[PDB]
Design an enzyme around this catalytic site. Structure first.
Site, short mmCIF file in Angstrom:
data_model
loop_
_atom_site.label_atom_id
_atom_site.label_comp_id
_atom_site.label_asym_id
_atom_site.label_seq_id
_atom_site.Cartn_x
_atom_site.Cartn_y
_atom_site.Cartn_z
N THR A 82 0.81 -1.21 0.00
CA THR A 82 0.00 0.00 0.00
C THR A 82 0.85 1.26 0.00
O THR A 82 2.03 1.26 0.34
CB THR A 82 -0.92 0.03 1.21
OG1 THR A 82 -0.18 -0.32 2.38
CG2 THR A 82 -2.05 -0.94 1.03
N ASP A 83 0.21 2.37 -0.37
CA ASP A 83 0.85 3.67 -0.51
C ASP A 83 0.95 4.44 0.79
O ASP A 83 1.35 5.60 0.77
CB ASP A 83 0.07 4.51 -1.50
CG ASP A 83 0.23 4.03 -2.91
OD1 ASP A 83 1.26 4.36 -3.52
OD2 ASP A 83 -0.67 3.33 -3.41
N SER A 142 2.17 8.67 4.33
CA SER A 142 1.35 8.75 3.13
C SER A 142 2.23 9.24 2.00
O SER A 142 2.59 10.42 1.96
CB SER A 142 0.17 9.67 3.34
OG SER A 142 -0.59 9.77 2.15
N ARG A 143 2.57 8.34 1.07
CA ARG A 143 3.56 8.67 0.06
C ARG A 143 3.06 9.69 -0.95
O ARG A 143 3.87 10.36 -1.58
CB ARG A 143 3.99 7.41 -0.67
CG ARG A 143 4.89 6.56 0.15
CD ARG A 143 4.90 5.15 -0.34
NE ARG A 143 6.01 4.41 0.23
CZ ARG A 143 5.99 3.11 0.49
NH1 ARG A 143 4.91 2.40 0.24
NH2 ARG A 143 7.06 2.53 1.01
N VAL A 144 1.75 9.82 -1.12
CA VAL A 144 1.25 10.87 -1.99
C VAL A 144 1.46 12.23 -1.34
O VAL A 144 1.70 13.23 -2.02
CB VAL A 144 -0.22 10.64 -2.35
CG1 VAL A 144 -1.11 10.97 -1.19
CG2 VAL A 144 -0.60 11.48 -3.53
#
Lengths: 136, 171, 284, 235, 117, 86, 117
Positions: free
Chosen positions: F7-8, F33-35
């Site tokens: 997951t991201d 949270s990579r975004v």
């Protein structure tokens, strides 16, 4: 000769047998020889002259004090820093100000400051008492 | 003879074992991993004159042969209590423990005293080195603990100060 | 749990033990140095108190305020406290003892007033709401008389100015390396002492300039010296309590490793078993 | 099965096993070779039986005895691991040697505090032997902490009871030294065999101030106490 | 490959100097926390002031990060890296504030930024 | 350990924070949270940047919470700001 | 069911207060076990002393445990427990010894037992 004790409130500054001294008493400069009659006076900030038996001289700086003579012993109850009534009142004003305004100074014990911080960091988030099943 | 990694040998033995489906043991190493190194390092031996004479059929008579071994083991995080590292500590005659906290501090070679020892000791040491070096090891060990205490304690006595700065010279 | 987390905790408890052992050694040396600095203070106070004894209640007497028992509308306190934690129960045993008696007094409708030495007491009584008129803090392990002049100057001035009627010092008394008792003692009006100067009818002093001018300074110097002595005894007691505290803490850490390692062994065995059983019972 | 032959001849035997842990481990290796399922911590399923069928032949029959002295290795410093946990079920006594007692120059370097024997009971050894052993143990384990007082506060701080406790603990500690017949090679002193009575007397003596009148080095490496005094005579 | 005989005593000494500074700053962080900063010696306060600037100057705005921060990115040659750190440690920049070094790039751009703040 | 890899991002809910009263028990510092900010409105993108650092400095000072009488009054500011934002 | 809409706001806030301070007590236990209780803040010793009171007041003598303790059982209505716990948490009963709370029913049986010590 007679025995001279120069002592401060903190630590002792001299002790040994003396042939004579010369001290700047508040009323006038004075000189004390063996058997001098009991005397008691303040003294002004300045030097004091000793001659250690066998005549060996030395000088000492005092911030003031009190000289108390008995026949066989004389003692100069020195003090650590200049005393007066303007200066002591300056100190009293600063000390009230540091309370009225809750100014908190640090100590200087860097050793305790290091060990306390290493201990606070080590003792954190261990949660051992949840892990060792010590009841408590 | 210097075995570059007796750890990377244990891993290859494990591999080629689990591919023959032999039942494993602790750490999934085959049951007889200890007998793997044991029968290797026990060849590092000194053998007396009668053995050499009787082996080479009289061609050599006065000599005694020998084979020193320096097996190298890799420890995770400085853990000497793992399966394979603790097997070999039981097989050999000593260990030199090379410490990362020393090596990263530029102390090279990072030989850690106290934890490192040789069980044959001075009998293997030339007389002059035995004489001069007799006290070096425990001196360094005690300096290395004292220098830890000194981290907190400013204003040390001048007996311990003369101990510390001397240990520091030698280190 | 998990054997590796428990090992990572054992390492930190051993580190804590290695810290508290060092703190105990440090405190045990500073205690000796502080009680050297303590006993070096006896001569000044002794030789000044003999002079006052001769001069003011021996074979003649003077009517200076500090020496006689006027009534008590309100009372002043000089509080000695540390600047460093980890002393154990020292400071708050002392503060509870103070509060008990300041309560006893205020039951009589009298007011009480405080001056603080050290920062722990400052924070405490600013939390509880007692009145603090002056303070000095951050003396550390180097108390000096040059810094005490302030607060005791305040308290003395407020004494002879009429605004106080009794003056106490509250402090710990270093008696033994292992025991230290919080004490409250009175230093105005001057507590009577033994050995009246009956033997000194033989001499009297050549007062220069005047005796009434000297006694007035002698008493101030004496009070300042007793406050300093209290500060230094408390400073020795601080070390002598911190060292026993760190002794106890080193033994608690050492007694906790013995439980952490049993939990660690159990986790190690469980992991070996549940891994090897998964390999064997899973295969065919 | 050689020791059992010597037993059947009516003798008393002493059987040394150089490491019982490696016996357990050879059993585990063979077990894994035969293909049997593992048990508690990777050990064979028959761990306790393979150990018992050995340790159960070492006993005192009417004809003779076998007494065993077995070097034990405890894995991972764990007295719970199934191998020690099984071995300890059979041991009657337990003597621990210590590096520290060795560095202090006392030999044999046995540790009096950690060593144990489940024969130390008034019923089986009598009351005098029992309480003498218990006394010297309590003496040494108080000294153990008085030494750490002294380490930090210096000798001056101790009560004049504890200074005598220390002076006696040091002499008890010395008296545990002994010259072996085999140690002659190292130290030239002729080895001594100390009958039990002599040990009980020596320690009954030291522990109650008798022989407080002679120095501690008069106990070191001496033998019986009726020789400790005669060594003291000529220091 | 971080040893003198491969990278040169210049680069090697600069690297070990930066590590030394940051290590001493890690030691001083908790003395600061407990005793405040006015208790330090005034060369220790220089270790702190230079360690903070070294710690800032290691940051750098990437080109590809232009989409996260909107700032344009920077490419810094090894020459300018050694020169910058070797300059900070030697006190050639004790007159700049800390924020002049953050996300700056070369050292010549720290001075150009100090004028603007 | 598979889904954490796929997951991201991660939201780590902890039972210690939940008991202590911090609800929702999200643990920042662990959670990611990579975004990142591309999934925010620019106001929130602007403001939330200072919350990350407030909490980061708090979590760095947090160990001294059980000795906060000792601390200097700059770290005391930082520590109480961390507590208030938490 | 422990939700403000299902159980009423006062009951919910009481339950969450009990949990909050029993948990804050759990966090303190390591530093107590190592450094001893005297290193606690002066308003943390208060938390420890209230948590140790709550722990006892959660105790109760059952009607079926007479066989094991002799003491007769108790039946404590809800209205009364959520009053007792507010009393303990708000410091109303902050002058009783811990053993006043061990194996009692209402808060009014703790205060009586305290008359006997």
């Amino acid at each position: 000769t007679y025995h001279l004790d120069v002592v401060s409130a903190e630590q002792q500054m001299f002790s040994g047998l003396v042939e004579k001294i010369q001290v700047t008493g508040s009323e006038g400069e004075l000189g004390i020889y063996p058997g001098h009659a009991p005397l008691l006076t303040a003294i002004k900030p300045g030097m004091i002259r000793i001659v250690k038996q066998h005549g060996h001289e030395e000088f000492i700086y005092l911030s003031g004090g009190i000289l108390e003579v008995q026949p066989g012993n004389v003692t100069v109850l020195a003090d650590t820093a200049i005393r007066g009534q303007d200066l002591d009142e300056a100190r009293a004003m600063e000390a009230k100000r540091k309370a009225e305004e809750h100014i908190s100074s640090s100590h200087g014990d860097v050793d305790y400051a290091q060990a306390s911080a290493e201990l606070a960091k080590a003792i954190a988030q261990l949660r051992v008492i949840e892990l060792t099943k010590k009841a408590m | 003879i210097i075995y570059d990694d007796l750890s990377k040998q244990a891993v290859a033995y494990r591999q080629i074992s689990l591919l023959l489906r032999r039942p494993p043991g602790r750490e999934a190493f085959p049951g007889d991993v200890f007998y793997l190194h044991s029968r290797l390092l026990e060849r590092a031996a000194r053998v007396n004159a009668e053995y050499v004479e009787a082996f080479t059929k009289g061609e050599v008579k006065g000599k005694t042969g020998s084979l020193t071994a320096l097996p190298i083991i890799e420890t995770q995080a400085g853990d000497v209590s793992a399966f394979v590292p603790t097997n070999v500590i039981s097989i050999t005659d000593g260990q030199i423990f090379l410490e990362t906290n020393l090596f990263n501090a530029g102390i090279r070679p990072a030989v850690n005293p106290g934890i490192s020892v040789s069980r044959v000791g001075g009998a293997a040491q030339t007389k002059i080195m035995k004489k001069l070096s007799g006290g070096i090891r425990t001196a360094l060990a005690q300096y290395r603990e004292l220098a830890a205490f000194s981290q907190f304690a400013s204003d040390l006595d001048d007996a311990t100060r003369k101990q510390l700065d001397h240990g520091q010279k030698v280190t | 749990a998990g054997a590796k987390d428990i090992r990572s905790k054992i390492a930190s408890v051993q580190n804590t033990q290695k810290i508290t052992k060092a703190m105990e050694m440090v405190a045990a040396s500073k205690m000796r140095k502080s009680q050297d600095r303590m006993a070096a203070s006896r001569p000044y106070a002794e030789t000044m108190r003999k002079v006052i004894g001769h001069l003011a209640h021996g074979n003649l007497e003077y009517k200076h305020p500090y020496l006689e028992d006027r009534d008590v509308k309100r009372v002043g306190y000089l509080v000695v406290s540390t600047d460093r934690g980890l002393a154990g129960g020292l400071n708050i045993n002392l503060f509870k003892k103070l509060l008990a008696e300041m309560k006893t007094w205020t039951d009589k409708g009298v007011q009480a007033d405080l001056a603080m030495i050290g920062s722990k007491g400052v924070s405490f009584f600013n939390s509880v709401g007692g009145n603090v008129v002056a303070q000095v803090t951050g003396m550390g392990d180097n108390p000096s008389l040059s810094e005490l002049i302030g607060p005791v100057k305040v308290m003395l001035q407020a004494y002879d100015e009429g605004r106080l009627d009794k003056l106490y010092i509250v402090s710990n008394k270093f008696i033994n390396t292992m025991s230290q008792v919080p004490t409250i003692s009175q230093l105005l009006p001057l507590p009577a002492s033994d050995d009246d100067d009956l033997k000194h009818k033989s001499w009297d002093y050549l007062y220069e300039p005047d005796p009434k001018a000297l006694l007035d300074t002698l008493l101030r110097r004496y009070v300042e010296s007793q406050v300093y002595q209290g500060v230094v005894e408390n400073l020795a007691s601080e070390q002598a309590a911190r060292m026993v505290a760190m002794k106890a803490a080193t033994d608690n850490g050492g007694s906790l490793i013995k439980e952490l390692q049993l939990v660690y062994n159990k986790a190690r065995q469980a992991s070996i078993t549940q891994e090897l059983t998964e390999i064997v019972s899973g295969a065919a | 099965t050689m020791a059992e032959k010597f037993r059947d001849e009516g003798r008393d035997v002493l059987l040394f096993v150089d490491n019982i842990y490696r016996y357990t481990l050879a059993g585990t290796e063979v077990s894994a070779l035969l293909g049997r399922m593992p048990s508690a911590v990777g050990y064979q399923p028959t761990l306790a039986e393979e150990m018992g069928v050995l340790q159960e032949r070492i006993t005192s029959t009417k004809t003779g005895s076998i007494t065993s002295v077995q070097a034990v290795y405890v894995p991972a410093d764990d007295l719970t691991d199934p191998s020690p946990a099984t071995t300890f079920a059979h041991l009657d006594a337990t003597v621990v040697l210590s590096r520290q007692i060795a560095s202090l120059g006392i030999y044999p370097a046995v540790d009096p505090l950690d060593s144990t024997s489940r024969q130390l009971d008034p019923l089986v050894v009598g009351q005098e032997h029992y309480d003498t052993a218990r006394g010297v143990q309590s003496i040494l384990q108080r000294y153990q902490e008085l030494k750490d007082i002294i380490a930090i506060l210096g000798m001056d701080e101790l009560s004049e009871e504890d200074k005598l406790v220390v002076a006696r603990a040091r002499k008890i500690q010395r008296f545990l030294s002994q010259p072996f017949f085999v140690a002659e090679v190292f130290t030239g002193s002729p080895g001594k065999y100390v009958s039990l009575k002599d040990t009980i007397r020596g320690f009954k003596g030291i522990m109650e101030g008798e022989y407080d009148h002679l120095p501690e080095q008069a106990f070191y490496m001496v033998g019986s106490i009726e020789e400790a005094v005669e060594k003291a005579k000529k220091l």
